[PDB]
Amino acid sequence: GRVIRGQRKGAGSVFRAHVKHRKGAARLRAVDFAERHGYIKGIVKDIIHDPGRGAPLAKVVFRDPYRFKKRTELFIAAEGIHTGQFVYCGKKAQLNIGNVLPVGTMPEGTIVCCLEEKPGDRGKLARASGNYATVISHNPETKKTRVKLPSGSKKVISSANRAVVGVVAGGGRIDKPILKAGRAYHKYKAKRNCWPRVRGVAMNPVEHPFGGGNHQHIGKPSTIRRDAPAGRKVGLIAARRTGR
C-alpha cells in the first residue's frame, strides 16, 4: 500500500503553515531587572488582526531601560484593551485587566490568559481566542502554584512565571456557525491545507486501512491502540470510551 494522508502531513511542503500575511509571533517580554523587581510601563499603539488566528494582537511599545530605543512587542490583547491604555509589566505592577505580572504574587482565584508554562519562554498556555486560566492555590515553600487550564486539567507550575490578567479577546467565535463551504474554505486557506477531509471509508483500500468492499463500511474495530504503527493508528486513538 501507498503512504496514507496524514502520514504525508509529516513531510510537509503542501501542509506547512501559511505564514506570509502573519504579523509575527505572539510572545511576552523577556526577563530582565525591571520586570523581575519593579514594573515597566508600555503603551498600546494599535490593535491588529492576525490571519489564521481567532484572537486580535495588541501592539505594545516599551522603552528599553538600558539603551535609548523604543521596543515593540506582540501582545495578545485581553478583552477590554484600548489604544493608548498604559500597560504595566513586572512584579510590582498592580492588578487589572491587561497587566502581566508573576503568578506567585497575585491572590488565587484571578482570571489570567496567555499563561507561561516554563519560567522564561514568554507565555504558552490559554491564549487561543477566548480561553483563560484560573489559580486554585499557591505554595510559598518550593514556589509552586496550581493553575486550572481551560482543558479542565490542573497543572502544578512554578510561581516565577507570569500571565496577563483577563480573558483572550474574541470569545464566542465558535458560537456562530460557518453556514457555508466557502467561509470554511477561506478559514483554513489562511492556516494550512487541511480542510477538504475525505473520509477513509469511501477511499480505496490502498490509501486507507478502512477502505474497500462493495459497501461503505469499516469492517474492523475503529478503536486503535496507542502503540500502533504509522498508517494503522487511524480512527479512535486509544479510546477509553466510545459512546455518549
Considering only residues 194 through 223, tell me which ones interact with RNA, judged by CB under 7 A.
194-210, 212, 215-223
Residue 70 in the binding site for RNA (CB under 7 A): no
Which region, judged by CB under 7 A, interacts with RNA, from 37-45, 88-96, 134-142, 143-151? 143-151
Distances (CA, A) of 108 to 95, 114, 117, 158: 12, 17, 17, 14
Reported in sequence order, the residue ranges of 29-187 that DSSP labels E, i.e. its strands, are: 39-49, 56-63, 70-76, 86-90, 100-102, 111-113, 133-139, 144-148, 154-158, 162-165
Angle at alpha carbon of residue 46, lines to 40 and 52, rounded to 5°: 110
40 beta partners: 89
3-state class (DSSP) for residue 123: coil
Per-residue x/- marks for RNA, 88-127, CB under 7 A?
-----------------------------xx-----xxxx
CB of 236 to RNA, least distance (A): 4
Residue 21 in the binding site for RNA (CB under 7 A): yes
Residue 235 in the binding site for RNA (CB under 7 A): yes
Among 2, 41, 82, 92, indicate the residue that binds RNA (CB under 7 A).
2
Which region, judged by CB under 7 A, interacts with RNA, from 2-10, 31-39, 86-94, 158-166? 2-10
Identify the CA nearest to 58 among candidates 133, 161, 187, 168: 168
CB of 20 to RNA, least distance (A): 4
C-alpha cell at 155: 497543572
Residue 144 in the binding site for RNA (CB under 7 A): no
